[PDB]
Amino acid sequence: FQGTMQAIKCVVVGDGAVGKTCLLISYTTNAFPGEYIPTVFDNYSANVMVDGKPVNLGLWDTAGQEDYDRLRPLSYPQTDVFLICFSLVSPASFENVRAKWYPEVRHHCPNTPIILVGTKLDLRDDKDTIEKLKEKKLTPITYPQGLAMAKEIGAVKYLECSALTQRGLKTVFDEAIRAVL
């Protein structure tokens, strides 16, 4: 009766420094914001209900490392939605969204939707973080900038979150799913 839960395959890309893995573990295990336990294994899954629809969300933690440029797109096929993430406190990872990630994804999956995600939303106001960036003559990415970037790459949504405070996290995954439904 009612068949099987809709299985949604969601593939997460971004630089290693973005800390995208922390997002997936915190959400899947529904962890306290401060503490979550790492595992020695790569993929995370959650059974969740969005808009009254229950689904089996599979979160693929891809490797940012360049060594994997050949190996990583093997699992791209069959994806329902793409999560593209960059650190709000790393303009380099931001620039890589346009430079490498979007092109790669688009090359391999032209019509699969994309969600742009801004990580470390909590650091964007940390003084020590702001200072170190300035010394390097860099400033954190702003909301208006992330949005423009999304518009540019043709991402369904642009969203900012913080694995540590957990604020804005649930939404990323809810919206990832609204994108598939």
Add this chain to the structure above:
Amino acid sequence: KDNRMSCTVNLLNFYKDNNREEMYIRYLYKLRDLHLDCDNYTEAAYTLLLHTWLLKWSDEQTHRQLKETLYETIIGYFDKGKMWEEAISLCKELAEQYEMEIFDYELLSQNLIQQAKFYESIMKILRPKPDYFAVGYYGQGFPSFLRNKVFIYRGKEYERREDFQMQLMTQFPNAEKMNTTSAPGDDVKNAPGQYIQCFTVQPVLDEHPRFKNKPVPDQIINFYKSNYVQRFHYSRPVRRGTVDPENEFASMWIERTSFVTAYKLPGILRWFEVVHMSQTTISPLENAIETMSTANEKILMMINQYQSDETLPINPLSMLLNGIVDPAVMGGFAKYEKAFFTEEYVRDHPEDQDKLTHLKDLIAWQIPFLGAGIKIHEKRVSDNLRPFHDRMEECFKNLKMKVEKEYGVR
């Protein structure tokens, strides 16, 4: 109306203590009606059971007919609740009466069919695992029935902590949400304001003797892992020192807290007060072991779900296998090898020697399961992912290989 319910139960309890059967019954119903407003079927059903505890299968509407009408309604509730095993267990009592006490075979056949439906559902209708949330109320601002107390709450279907805590904060708007799961000091306990701790806790499978040594199917054992439970865990990771930028695992310890409620969940309420709390600490080694077991349990469970049904999407299988076969992002168990298999780690700890062998066994254990699952994946993988499957095999082969030598084939 948590307050009203708590109140009703407080009333209801007092009535039990002072034998006031008429009053007690009046309150059972008051309580039942409240659950129905909320659609808490299972808790509504358990509350009615308090009535039938007073009834007996006699002719003294007489007792047997009343107890009967009641069992029917309760069984109806559990069905909506999806506590099929609880429903079945009430069916059996009725069937005994029909079969051996009043020989009503027509009603009996009806009962048996109802049981056939519940047994079937258990196996074929998957029920979402509920979540448990601990809440601590630590301000002096709290009334005396909540003051400095911990309660475990049974989550509604697909209810997530973000949703729950929101309603909770709504209930108390001056309460501050604590940012630790750690047991609060007396400094906060004797404070004037309201402070609220809230986190998800893990249920512990209570031991049932029916399943004590027999081979029970996941399908019917898993249900007991998240229901009928009285004990719960929260695990937090604490780093001890000498952190390595290479493998955090070597230095990661877990503080684990245990909560025991006074009554099992589900019951007459969605929450019961924690009556005992304990903390135990687990070493990176012990942690690696749990981690390894979970991984193997999951792989085995998955290969079994797939050996059965073939209408199952493969995405969830690909994902699990690949993330264990080729853990690019996180370490892999190499991290565990690098961390505990040094000549040095063994020398420092001789106690762990029994454990190290156990850890080794899991790794050997992993490969068969992995290949077993890979066999399945091979047979049923869409052709656009064939290249993906082919790589996954190569790593596996590679992996099978390095492991077989180091650790004997299992």
